[PDB]
C-alpha cells in the first residue's frame, strides 16, 4: 500500500534512453512502449540510434522498470518500486559476464509528465574481442528468471541478486551475474519489503518493417515468495 | 538445421522481398542494372534453427521467382535475427524457365 501505487492502476506510457560505452565502442538506444502493472505486462520497442549495436540485444534486456511488476494484494506492502513514485528511484547494477567483461549501469526511473522514463548510463570494460558478447555469439531469445529482493534499510531502498542465463549459439549458456541497488530520489516515505522475488518471463522479437538495428520486448513480471493466509492456520 | 519448405503467398511483403533481392543483386553487378518487375508464384519459405540441442528459431529462408528487366530469376534470401542487417541475398541467377 502506497500513494505511488495509484499511478499504475492503468496503462502507462514508457520511454527508455540509454547511452553506452563498451570497450570504447560508444552507442545509444531509444525505446518506447507501455506498461500495465495490473497484469505485470510490459511492451517495448528499442532502436539503436547510432547504427549497429556493438553488443547483442539480449545483454541489455535487464538494463532497459520493475515498478510495472504485478504484486499480489497480500504483498502490496512490499512494493518498493511504486512507493518511490512519482519522484522515482535510482537503479544501479554491476553485471559480470562469466569469463568475460562487465557492465556497470546507473539509471533513473521516474515520471516525466504522464510518461514513466528510464534513463541509463552504461559502461562496459574488460570484454574479450571475440568472446560471446563482442563476438555476437548469443541466440536472439530470452529465458525466465527470478529476481531476489531484500530490504536495504540503511539506504531506505532495496537490493537484488540474480543470474541471467544467455543461450549461446554453440549450445552452451553464458552467465551474467547481476547485483542491483535501488534508492529513492525523493524523501517521502517508501515501502521496505520482506524477502521476496520477481518471477520474470520475456519474449524477444523483430519488427518485420524495421530497417534499424532494434529489439521488440514483451515481458510479464509477477511478485512471489511470500505465502498467503498464514495467520489463519493458528486461529 | 532447418524445417521444411512451404508455399507462401505473394502479397506486398513478398514483393518487397523480391525488391530487396534485386537491390542487392544490383550492388554486385553480375547482370548489369536490373529493374524489379514482380515476384510470381510459387514462393517458398522454411524456418532456420540454431544448430544446437535447443533448436530455437534463428530465422527464415526464402526461395523466390523474380522478374527483373523482363527476365526471370531465382533468388534465395535469408533472414537471420542474430546478426544485423538481418536479410542477406544468398543466390540470384538466371534467366530461368518459368515454373
Q: A71 near A78, Cβ under 8 Å?
A: yes
Interchain CB distance below 8 Å, B83 and A53: no
Structurally, how many domains does chain A consist of? 1
State CA A195 to chain mean position distance. Answer: 18
Q: Which of A191, A226, A193 is nearest to A1 (CA)?
A: A191
| Residues from chain A contacting residue B50 (CB–CB below 8 Å) | 139, 167, 169
CA A46 – CA A49 distance, rounded (Å): 9
Distance in angstroms (rounded) separating the CA atoms of residues B25 and B19: 10
Q: Tell me the three-class secondary structure of chain B, residue by residue.
A: CECCCEEECCCHHHHHHHHHHHHHHHHHCCCCCCCEEEEEEEEEEEEEECCCCCCCEEEEEEEEEEEECCEEEEEEEEEECCCCCCEEEEEEECCCCCC
Secondary structure element (H or E) that encloses residue A4, with its range: none
Phi, psi of A221 (to 5 degrees): -125, 130
CB contact under 8 Å between A170 and B82, yes or no, is no
A46, β-bridge pairs: A31, A215
CA distance A171 to chain B (A): 5
Which residues lie across from A167 on neighbouring strands? A173
Helix (H) or strand (E) holding A80: helix A80-83
Between A and B, how many CB-CB pairs are < 8 A? Answer: 32
How would you classify the pairing of strands A25-36 and A41-48?
antiparallel
Check if the beta carbon of residue A67 is closer than 8 Å to that of residue A190: no
Cell of A46: 528499442
Distance of CA A1 to the CA centre of its chain: 22
Residue A60, SS3 per DSSP: helix
State whether residue B83 sits within 8 Å of chain A by CB: yes
Q: Counting beta carbons within 10 angstroms of the beta carbon of residue A46, is it exposed (0 to 12), middle (13 to 18) or buried (19 or more)?
A: buried
A167:B84 CB<8 A: no
Question: Buried b / exposed e across A15-26, counting CB within 10 Å, b at 16+?
Answer: ebbbebebbeee
Q: Which of B13, B54, B81 sits opposite A206 (nearest CB)?
A: B81
CB of A14 within 8 A of CB of A34? yes
Which residues, including other chains, have CB under 8 Å from residue A24's CB and lie 6 or more apart? none
Residue the block writes with cell 524477502: A195
Residues of B in contact with A141 (CB under 8 A): 56
Scored b (16 or more CB within 10 A) or e, B33-59 reads ebebeebeeebbbeebebeeeeeeebb
CA nearest to B51, candidates A63, A2, A25, A167: A167
Contact A104, A122 (CB under 8 A): yes
Chain A touched by B50 (CB under 8 Å): yes
The domain locations on chain B are 1-99
Q: Which residue of B has its CA nearest to A54?
A: B84
CA atoms within 13 A on the CB side of A165: 10
Q: Is the Cβ–Cβ distance between A103 and A55 less than 8 Å? A: no
Whole-number Å distance between alpha carbons of A99 and A11:
40
A167 and B86 within 8 Å at the Cβ level: the answer is no
Residues found in chain A: 235
Cβ–Cβ gap B56/A206 under 8 Å? no
Could you list the residue range(s) of the whole structural domain that residue A85 is in? Answer: 4-235
Tell how strand B6-8 and strand B36-49 pair up.
antiparallel
| C-alpha grid cell, residue A48 | 539503436
**Cis bond before residue B85 (omega within 30° of 0):** yes
Beta bridge partners of B65: B40, B74
Contact list, A138 vs chain B (CB under 8 Å): 82
CATH number at residue A223: 2.40.155.10
- Euclidean distance between CA atoms A66 and A158, whole angstroms: 12
Q: Are A168 and A174 in contact (CB under 8 A)?
A: yes
Q: How far apart are CA B72 and CA B99, in angstroms?
A: 10
User: In this structure, are residues B58 and A139 in contact, taking their beta carbons and an 8 Å threshold?
Assistant: yes
Residue A142: all three cell numbers together = 530470452
Amino acid at each position: 500500500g502506497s500513494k505511488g501505487e495509484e499511478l499504475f492502476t492503468g496503462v502507462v506510457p514508457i520511454l527508455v534512453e540509454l547511452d553506452g560505452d563498451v570497450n570504447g565502442h560508444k552507442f545509444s538506444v531509444s525505446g518506447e512502449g507501455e506498461g500495465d502493472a495490473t497484469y505485470g505486462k510490459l511492451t517495448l520497442k528499442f532502436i539503436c540510434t547510432t547504427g549497429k549495436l556493438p553488443v547483442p540485444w539480449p545483454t541489455l534486456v535487464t538494463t532497459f522498470v520493475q515498478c510495472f511488476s504485478r504484486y499480489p494484494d497480500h504483498m502490496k506492502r512490499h512494493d518498493f518500486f511504486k512507493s518511490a513514485m512519482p519522484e522515482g528511484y535510482v537503479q544501479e547494477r554491476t553485471i559480470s559476464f562469466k569469463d568475460d567483461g562487465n557492465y556497470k549501469t546507473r539509471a533513473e526511473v521516474k515520471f516525466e509528465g504522464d510518461t514513466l522514463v528510464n534513463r541509463i548510463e552504461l559502461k562496459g570494460i574488460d570484454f574479450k574481442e571475440d568472446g560471446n558478447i563482442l563476438g555476437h555469439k548469443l541466440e536472439y531469445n530470452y529465458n525466465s528468471h527470478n529476481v531476489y529482493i531484500t530490504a536495504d534499510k540503511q539506504k531506505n531502498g532495496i537490493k537484488a541478486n540474480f543470474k541471467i542465463r544467455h543461450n549461446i549459439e554453440d549450445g552452451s549458456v553464458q552467465l551474467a551475474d547481476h547485483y542491483q541497488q535501488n534508492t529513492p530520489i525523493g524523501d517521502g516515505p517508501v515501502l521496505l519489503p520482506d524477502n521476496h522475488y520477481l518471477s520474470t518471463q520475456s519474449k524477444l522479437s523483430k519488427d518485420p518493417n524495421e530497417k534499424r538495428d532494434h529489439m521488440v520486448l514483451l515481458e510479464f513480471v509477477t511478485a512471489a515468495g511470500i505465502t498467503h493466509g498464514m495467520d489463519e492456520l493458528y486461529k | 538445421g532447418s524445417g521444411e519448405w512451404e508455399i507462401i503467398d505473394i502479397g506486398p511483403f513478398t514483393q518487397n522481398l523480391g525488391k530487396f533481392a534485386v537491390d542487392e543483386e544490383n550492388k554486385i553487378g553480375q547482370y548489369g542494372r536490373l529493374t524489379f518487375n514482380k515476384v510470381i508464384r510459387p514462393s517458398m519459405k522454411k524456418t532456420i534453427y540454431y544448430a544446437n540441442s535447443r533448436g530455437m528459431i534463428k530465422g527464415y529462408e526464402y526461395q523466390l521467382y523474380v522478374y527483373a528487366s523482363d527476365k526471370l530469376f531465382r533468388a534465395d534470401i535469408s533472414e537471420d535475427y542474430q546478426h544485423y542487417p538481418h536479410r542477406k541475398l544468398l543466390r540470384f541467377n538466371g534467366p530461368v524457365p518459368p515454373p
